[model samples]
Target chain A: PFLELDTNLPANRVPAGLEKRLCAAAASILGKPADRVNVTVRPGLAMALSGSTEPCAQLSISSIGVVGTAEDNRSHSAHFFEFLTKELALGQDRILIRFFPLESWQIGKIGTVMTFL
Target chain B: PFLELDTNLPANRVPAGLEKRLCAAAASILGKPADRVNVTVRPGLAMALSGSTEPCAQLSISSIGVVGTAEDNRSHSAHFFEFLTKELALGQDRILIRFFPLESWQIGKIGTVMTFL
Candidate 1:
């Protein structure tokens, strides 16, 4: 489900046509053949990002399960993020994650974690 | 702090030289004289991304504001995002925000906002 950032949809709900949008965006951003790169959703984290219940939606991006014990995979994810934020003048919080026990996550921000769980 | 993307630093707490790296990377990507631009922390959002209970350090970028009447401002931002997502192949969840009353936001990505956030 690929919705616009402010698309006013629940993050947990997958929208139709997201693949095309993401692919187009990805192609433009990465300067690669969109067909070559495949993106999949990390459901738990996605639901967490799509938590807003409002006409105006806000977003969050998290990286989870990136640790595969392969140093290169980890390195790539880290580099990928840095390239996204610092190089992009991005805020970095756009990505989300929960590596330990998914149940332990208290979503939201710093002290604001949604311990409402 | 402006730690590495995977750096185990807390978001609210900034690192020593983050500005420099941000400037450097931002400069390279935006192709501008870093001195001419002023970068400020939308602070609240920064803290949101740095939230992590593990060494994994998942990120969530949420955009908080961009509602000026002058479209150039908003356009710059939207364009910045499109240019970012399209040209960069970024996951789109890399940008964070919380506009308006300022209390509405959720972080994570869609494989559409964090899968499809």
Candidate 2:
């Protein structure tokens, strides 16, 4: 799984060690190995939600299986929403989480597409 | 349309006014009004591609229409791949572009979900 978090909050405001924390959380939630998960945090960026620039964020997660359906995503969302609310002080309504269910061929690993691996 | 560019390249390597340039290009290519387009550039980040932490990028584009098909994405990919190669000096193979076609209810606008509008 690969997760990227983009937020309008300043870099200093983002908790330290967030990338690792998110990586572990995501791996646990997605049922993927921690080593196979990648997390990126991009903070202090220009972002907007609901036409306002006030603190907001977008989390995009791409993985094969374990996503792409409402039932699965709702459970995942609840976990992340609570996590972010406590960690980043973001309101649940101001956060957008998008999940992409990918195919093996759509991702690259070990210097080639996962399909080839 | 919302376009985000996440790159492992140093911040200084990114061209000046790149956000505006990309926003304009995206609006044109995606067939949307420029005013409705939003672009974000995040550089100097720890990122990896194909198991290597080298100069690479991931561009995620989300829009209401004009995406979500292999045919549509292939064309958009060509345009963006060429553009990024020229502007960022990144190899074509090192860039990843993902397009998301979203529904009105999936997006928030004007202080509410677009579906409400």
Candidate 3:
């Protein structure tokens, strides 16, 4: 779980800020420029979030037509996500992610928490 | 995959290795040290890889006991075999992973290669 920058800028590194940015980007892409979005870090294993217009987890960007967990330090227990492909670079049709900074996350050949993201 | 090392070290970092270490660690806990094991990645993706020694994919140490992918920089188009977590610290049942830098592989918002391991 990482954030997309407007070109890998540092000021754009906040994970919390990213959730909003994702929503905004979705809105911008969909022409819903004025739409309001909410992204939250969901908790619990075997959690079933059901409600109309209520997303199953936080960071719900409906534009992608997929649902992924907006994880927090808590939900770090056991969680996987259900992903879907909606609108992306106009028909790119794929899921991809680029990584950032392995140093801070790697120690003695062990990984760390991307807690902020 | 270490090929070694981990705290308490449960199959400790190898998912594929974890399978073999799975039994050995049990044996170790039961009574054995220099054990032999094997593990594999699951690459069904709707197109399953069926076999016992065949890990559904790739990577090594039961001491580290887990499985993950390494990659290569191909010209655009990718995102597979990146994150691997089958086991960790004999004590820390937690799965851990750290990603490398995000330079490019996919056009935008797509995952790139770790296709090596």
Candidate 4:
């Protein structure tokens, strides 16, 4: 399994073809082949950021290993922000991306919290 | 309290009428009303299974309780799998559903690791 990108963005202004473009962008930034990457664009989710709803979006990326350190992720983060802002007309302050390293995720019946295989 | 459905079908082939149908199906299957259920349909996500794309889909269903046991959840899962295959034209192998029981999920409230609700 590769990275799964999940997002919570407001519905009204989400761009057409964002999911396709995002998957491609993520592949480029994550150094993974486009076929091995996954991107999910979920617009119109109910969420609250800073107690305001000013065109904000949140991106959650989960991968087999840590995506990178702060400095390394910073460049990728910038590109993501740029992509979202230009493509979706969102503000810089309104977007947040969180990265997670998956020690275990479900696959074909094996599980986490103990299964090390 | 709800379910979040995610998919990875090709972007160009997704249907405009899919998400609404899924939310409605999930709500009915899970015994939750439409407004209380949370559903997301993401298209064009990159994913591979059995080394084939083959119009596949994956759904994650999480709630406070177990949702149901094998017999209990079977009905719900059947409805869900049926919904995706019929509406989205995906194969049975292309659709997989997993359930999780969550002790805590973020809500608009005070931070807590030691505090018990």
Model 3: per-residue Cα lDDT over B1-117, one tens digit each: 111111222222333433344334433331223232211222222221232322232222222212222432121102111222324212112322232222222112221122211
B15 Cα displacement, candidate 3 (Å) = 14
The sequence of per-residue lDDT tens digits that candidate 2 reaches over residues A23-117 is 77877788887766666677888987989999998998888889989999999998988888888887788899999898654443323334444
Task: Tell me the lDDT of model 3 at A104.
Answer: 28
Q: How close is candidate 4 to the true structure, as a TM-score?
A: 0.53
For all candidates in order, the CA lDDT equals 0.32, 0.77, 0.25, 0.60
Task: Give model 3's TM-score versus the native structure.
Answer: 0.19
Clashing pairs in 2: none
TM-scores of the candidates in the order shown: 0.20, 0.60, 0.19, 0.53
lDDT of 4 at A50: 75
For each model in turn, which proportion of the native inter-chain contacts is also found? 0.05, 0.04, 0.06, 0.03
Stretches of candidate 3 off by over 4 Å are A1-21, A33-36, A40-117, B1-117
- Rank candidates, TM-score, best first: 2, 4, 1, 3
The residue ranges of model 2 lying beyond 4 angstroms of the native Cα positions read A5-61, A66-100, A103-117
How does the DockQ of candidate 4 come out? 0.10
Residues A11-75, model 3: lDDT tens digits: 22224444455555544433445344334432221111111111112121222212222222112
Question: Per-prediction DockQ, in order?
Answer: 0.05, 0.10, 0.06, 0.10
| Per-residue alpha-carbon lDDT of candidate 2 for residues B1-117, written as tens digits (9 for 90 to 100) | 988888878889899999998987887788899999999887987554443456878887888867666556666666777777788987866677666678998988779998888
Q: Best by lDDT, which number?
A: 2
Comparing to the true complex, what docking class would candidate 4 get? incorrect
Over A1-117, each residue of candidate 1 has an lDDT whose tens digit, in order, gives 112222222345545565455555544443456774344432211111122212222222222232222332233334444433432233444433211111225345456554553
lDDT of 4 by residue, A15-73 (tens): 66665677677777877666655555556567667788555778777555546578767
lDDT tens digits, residues B1-117, model 4? Answer: 455545555666778767677677877777776775666666655454333445567677766554535544555566776677788777666665555545554432356531265
